[PDB]
Structure formats: C-alpha cells, structure tokens
C-alpha cells in the first residue's frame, strides 16, 4: 500500500480500509474508533468546501479580476442587505447541517424526504449520501473516493495558500503566480522574510486593519501576524 513516507510502518489503527489511507497519523488522532468516525466526515466536509472555494476564487479572479476575493464581502453589493442574505443562509444551512449531522448520529434515519414520502435515499454510508445527490458516477466509486480525498487535501492546502498569499502579497492567487513567475528568486517567502539570531524580518500585512462597511467598522486582522517568519 503506497505510504506517505516510503519504507515506514503505518500506525496500527491505519490498516487501509478508508480511502486516502497513506498511513499518515503521526499524533495518533485517529486511534479511537468513534473519533475516527467524526474526523473522517470532517475531512470530507472540509475537502468539498475547500475544493469549491479554490475553484470559485480562481474563477472569480478570471471573470471579475478587478475584485480581490479577500475584499469581496465588503465589495459585493446586492439589494438583499447583508442581514437579509445572512438570515436566509442561516436557516438553509441549519437545516442541511442538522440533516447531515443526524445521519452521522443515527445512520439511515434521514434518507426520507420530509415533504414527499415517495422519495428516500437508498441505504448508504455517512459522508456518501448518493441517491439524488449522485445522479451520475463516471467510473469505479472506490477510485473516485480516492480522487475526491486527494483533490480535496490539495484544495484544503491551496486555500490556506490563497489566504497567506493575500495577507503577504495583497493579491489573488493568479496575480501572485505571475509575481513569482516574474522574479522567482525574489518572490518566494525566503526572499520576503528571514529570521537569524541577531535580528528578525517579516513581510508586512498588506490587508487594511479595519474595514468600514455600512457604518459598522469590521475588524480585519492578519493571521498570527506576530509569529510570521
């Protein structure tokens, strides 16, 4: 079985049953069965949210270059005021999140449509609703379960890159790649920061500290700026 460190022995709890199992659990966070059952769903949810966000941020930059994703919340203007938009989001997510959660707490107890009795998801697994949520499957499901986790772990690490790049460069994903491609030797973080016993040098936060939005002033801090290289 391919492993994260060739030649290494995987944790005893990491046999190889779960998709994406490359024997990586150095801290032993998944040695408890009931804990592993939660973290597995959490990894899937994080993966799918990140994959859509990384796709959306890149597309938004191409279709709407003038708008920096980090500044979108304040810039995007709609007739449905911030509160009206949030109310709708809150109720819709409360329902879907509770429905998905109850599946994890009692599998098979939330596969039935609550308005139409004729529609019920077939018996399935937590994290893999299927049924109406899976109209087409282009290939072996097991193989795609590996593709989903691998493309998700990469996206989750990309978003974090988009965030730190935004705070260190003030630019969207593409605008950074171009800066780096213009001068790779002088655009890497090593060429932007340096700590030695004598002194410490860190790139400045390029994100305004506060934003003014509909007369509120929203706090907008950089992430662990004090611990920045």
């Amino acid at each position: 079985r391919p492993l994260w460190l060739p030649g290494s022995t995987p944790p005893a709890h990491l046999k190889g049953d779960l998709p994406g199992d490359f024997g990586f659990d150095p801290l032993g966070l998944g040695a408890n069965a009931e804990s592993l059952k939660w973290f597995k769903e959490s990894e899937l949810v994080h993966s799918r949210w990140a994959m859509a966000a990384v796709a959306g941020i890149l597309v938004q930059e191409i279709v709407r270059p003038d708008v920096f994703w980090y500044n979108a919340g304040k810039e995007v203007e709609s007739p449905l005021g911030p509160l009206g938009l949030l109310a709708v989001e809150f109720f819709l997510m409360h329902w879907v999140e509770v429905r998905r959660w109850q599946d994890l707490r009692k599998p098979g107890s939330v596969d039935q449509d609550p308005i139409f009795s004729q529609y019920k998801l077939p018996p399935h697994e937590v994290g893999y609703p299927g049924g109406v949520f899976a109209p087409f499957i282009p290939g072996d499901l097991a193989e795609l379960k590996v593709k989903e986790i691998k493309n998700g772990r990469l996206a989750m690490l990309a978003f974090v890159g988009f965030v730190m790049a935004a705070q260190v460069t003030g630019k969207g994903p593409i605008a950074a790649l171009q800066e780096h491609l213009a001068d790779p030797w002088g655009t890497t973080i090593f060429s932007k920061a340096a700590v030695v016993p004598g002194q410490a040098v860190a790139p400045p936060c390029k994100i305004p500290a506060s934003v003014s939005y509909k007369g509120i002033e929203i706090p907008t801090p950089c992430f662990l700026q004090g611990l920045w290289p």
Partner: protein, 227 residues
C-alpha cells in the same frame, strides 16, 4: 592482529576490525552501543565526503581565482556572474528543497535499510546499496565497487579523516591569518619564523557581523582572539 592508534593500547571489544579504518580508537567509548556506532559511522561518512569536497573546493578555487577569499565567498557581491547579488533567500530556497529530499531519502535508508532503494517515480530504477552509506549503482557510475570494496572503503575513510582535519586547519588559519590555505603556506615559506601560529594566533581577523542583502549575520571565531 591489526595496527592500532597507539603502541600498547587494547582495542575496545566492540571494535574488532569489521568497519574500515578501525584502529581500535574510542577513548570516550561512544561506540559501545551498537545503534550509536551505526549512526556515528554514517555521520563519519557524511563529514568525510563533505570535508573532502570542501578541501578540494577551497584549493581549486584558490588556484583558479587567487583573488577571491574562500572565507568570504558566500557574500553575494562575491558570487560569480550571473549570480552576483542574486537574492540569497531565493538561493537558500533551492538548497533547502533539494537537500531536504536527498537527506530524508538517505535518512529513511538508515531507519529501514533497503526501504528507499528504488526510484519513487520511474519504477524499476534501483540502486544496489550493498552496505548502508554505500548506495552504488547510479552513485557508482564507473564500477569501482566491483573489486576490493573494503580496501577502497579504507582509503575513503582515511582520506576523509585527513580532509576533515585539513578543512578545520584552513578555517582556523583563515581566522588567524585572513588568507586561504595556499597563501598561508606562501607566507610561512616567505618567513617561517616571522609568519607562524606563534604570532598569528591571538588575533581573529573576522569581523563581528556582515550585512548580507539587508540581514546582519553574526560571525564568530573558534577562540577569543583580538576581533
């Protein structure tokens, strides 16, 4: 049996003559633990091969460019074109990434011998790795292992140990004199009694710090000498 580091000394029981360059020399008994001896032998191989490349670099560079001082070649302003004043940070980026791969590969071979003896990409490409620290194959492109490997391992460790002492001579001579290893010899031969450690020692000719592209790197000599 074999020759030892001194006349009358009894070799440690753990040093029986298996490893090349075994003069039964372990005054501080650091090889008594088998696990430690294995790691220390790898460490000794690493320090030997790196030091032999270092002695050869300082000497070759000194002959080709006698105007460039080895102790201060790392300064980017002294980098050869087109690398002069190149972003040192960007340069360290390449070294960290490349070295980290090769060093973790070699490391995993220590943790599990013969566990990383295959190309992780182009499967089928494999190094023989007869002994730990001796990969061979692509690493031995001329086939010199297919002979008296043990006698060649002796020449390697012996030349390496001598090069490790020499390199530290170059460093200390550079710190006390301010010149490279062939320039120091010339100064000695120029006036052996006039120029020697008796007078050279007592002075650190190295600044306290240098500004590299905006960063102050603190510098120290190996002894409290006038700095």
């Amino acid at each position: 049996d074999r020759k030892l580091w001194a006349p009358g000394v009894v070799a440690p029981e753990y040093l029986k003559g298996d490893l090349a360059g075994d003069y039964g020399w372990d005054p501080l008994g650091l090889g008594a633990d088998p696990t430690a001896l294995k790691w220390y032998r790898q460490s000794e191989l690493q320090h030997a091969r790196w030091a032999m490349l270092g002695v050869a670099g300082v000497l070759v560079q000194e002959i080709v460019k006698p105007d460039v001082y080895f102790y201060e070649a790392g300064l980017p302003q002294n980098l050869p074109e087109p690398f002069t004043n190149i972003n040192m940070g960007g340069l360290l980026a390449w070294e960290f990434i490349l070295m980290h791969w090769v060093e973790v590969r070699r490391w995993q071979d220590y943790k599990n011998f013969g566990s990383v003896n295959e190309d992780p990409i182009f499967k089928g490409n494999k190094v023989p790795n007869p002994e730990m620290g001796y990969p061979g194959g692509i690493f031995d492109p001329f086939g010199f292992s297919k002979g008296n490997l043990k006698e060649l391992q002796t020449k390697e460790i012996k030349n390496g140990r001598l090069a490790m002492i020499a390199y530290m001579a170059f460093i200390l001579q550079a710190q006390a004199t301010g010149k490279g290893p062939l320039a120091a010899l010339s100064a000695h031969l120029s006036n052996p009694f006039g120029n020697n450690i008796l007078k050279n020692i007592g002075t650190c000719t190295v600044p306290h710090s240098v500004d590299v592209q905006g960063l102050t790197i603190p510098l120290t000599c190996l002894w409290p000498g006038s700095q």
